[PDB]
């Protein structure tokens, strides 16, 4: 199917501290493969997936230099943004950046992205055509002006359509065992009486990959979207994900409800029904 | 592989 590579950066100013905090992580689809933490002892990009450990010394030294450069650029940005918003050095602020690329089934470029945020909200983002910017407010217009004058988009576009996709393909191949896989969900249902007239039916999906999944409940043929309690898909810690969906039903009517599970690792959607 | 040239905001 389609794939993606994405890098996520978090920059946090720390008043009274010698240095702000900087954390970078890289992902291919839903699998993390690298990380950097400015506070850590090594001061290098580190592997977080087995298939990337294959990369040689030149790869790691190069990624380390580039991430340390990202760190320095972000250290400066913290001060710049405080200026644009005329904020004091007393408070801690956050900058986040995400960029990457998506490829299709043929593994060819489908789309690129580069988004930037300040204090949890959009600040500036590269549009889909990868030629122009969308500025969220007055302050971001200064950044937009600066980036247009320096022809930032043209250079960035080249990375997203070339380097980004080329390395994603390399990772997809080198990490085929891990990345080019699908683990179908292991499903089951639980029952808990809420009272003497009502009970909770919880549908479970476990050990699946990728994270994309759809759990839905039905009462004899019809959707229960509104009355369904759904939790966020969560990581198991072993590389797979988990999720559940529940409904409260009248004692004695359990058999009328059905849980439907949709996932790419399944040849056909699954339908579960409770049985005493 | 990371982007190489990053421009300050």
């Amino acid at each position: 199917g389609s794939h993606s590579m994405r890098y996520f950066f978090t920059s946090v100013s720390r008043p009274g501290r010698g240095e702000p905090r900087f954390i970078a992580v890289g992902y291919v689809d839903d699998t993390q493969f690298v990380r950097f933490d400015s506070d850590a002892a090594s001061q290098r990009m580190e592997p977080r997936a087995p298939w990337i450990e294959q990369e040689g010394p030149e790869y790691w030294d190069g990624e380390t230099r580039k991430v340390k450069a990202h760190s320095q650029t972000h250290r400066v940005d913290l001060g710049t943004l405080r200026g644009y918003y005329n904020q004091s050095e007393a408070g801690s602020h956050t900058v986040q950046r995400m960029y990457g690329c998506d490829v299709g089934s043929d593994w060819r470029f489908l789309r690129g992205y580069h988004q930037y945020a300040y204090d949890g909200k959009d600040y500036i983002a590269l549009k889909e055509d990868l030629r122009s910017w969308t500025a969220a407010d007055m302050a971001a217009q200064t950044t937009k002006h600066k980036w247009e004058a320096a022809h930032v988009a043209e250079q960035l576009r080249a990375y997203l359509e070339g380097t980004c996709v080329e390395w994603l393909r390399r990772y997809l191949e080198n990490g085929k065992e891990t990345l080019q896989r699908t683990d179908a969900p292991k499903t089951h249902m639980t029952h808990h009486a809420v009272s003497d007239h009502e009970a909770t039916l919880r549908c479970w999906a476990l050990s699946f990959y990728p994270a994309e999944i759809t759990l839905t409940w039905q009462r004899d043929g019809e959707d229960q979207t509104q009355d369904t309690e759904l939790v966020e898909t969560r990581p198991a810690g072993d590389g797979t994900f988990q999720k559940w969906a529940a409904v409260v039903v009248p004692s004695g009517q359990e058999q009328r409800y059905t849980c439907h599970v949709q996932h790419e690792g399944l040849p056909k959607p699954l339908t579960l029904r409770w049985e005493p | 592989s990371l982007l190489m040239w990053i421009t300050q905001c």
Partner: T-cell receptor
Amino acid sequence: GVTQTPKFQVLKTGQSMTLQCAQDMNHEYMSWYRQDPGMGLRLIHYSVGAGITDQGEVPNGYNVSRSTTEDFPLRLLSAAPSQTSVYFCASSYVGNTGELFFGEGSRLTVLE
Amino acid sequence: QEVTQIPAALSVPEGENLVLNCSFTDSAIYNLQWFRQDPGKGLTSLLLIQSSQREQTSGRLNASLDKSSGRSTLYIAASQPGDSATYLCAVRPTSGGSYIPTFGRGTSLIVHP
């Protein structure tokens, strides 16, 4: 801009010395060069940010450090006649136009 | 990965339009920069051409970039004696993660009054 010092310096073999380079443009990239007749500009050391420095083409006999954004001092622990040369500090963003900004240059003569 | 400037020396009568050449072996560059240096003096930047741009102009100076052919040409119109100096060409990589520039040896130019 870029300000490096001293502009001229005489040293006796074995003496230590440190050339200073400071920039106020918030440049992440800073570097040191030595330029010699028939040798062109040769990179000694460079740094893409605080807490990181890397060797250039001719690092032997030179030491650098990048504790701050603004400064990138070049230190000669034990000056040798072979280090007589003209030194240039150059800085730039690791983005934007990527344009290099050179300091005025420091002339160093090491004598026995 | 290699920058060359040929001819390495140029002698011209004041007033003529001149051309300085720059060539590089690796087309994957982030920018190309032209400088001038007088003997015993420092390096003054003249023009910076980003990899996505074709040319830059400043006064009597104009430089073009042909990334695909691995070359750049620096044009100086109505040359003056004061243009006498060594002109240096440098480029930086678009990828790799070193950021290190590659300099050419330079072309020594003499404009005779």
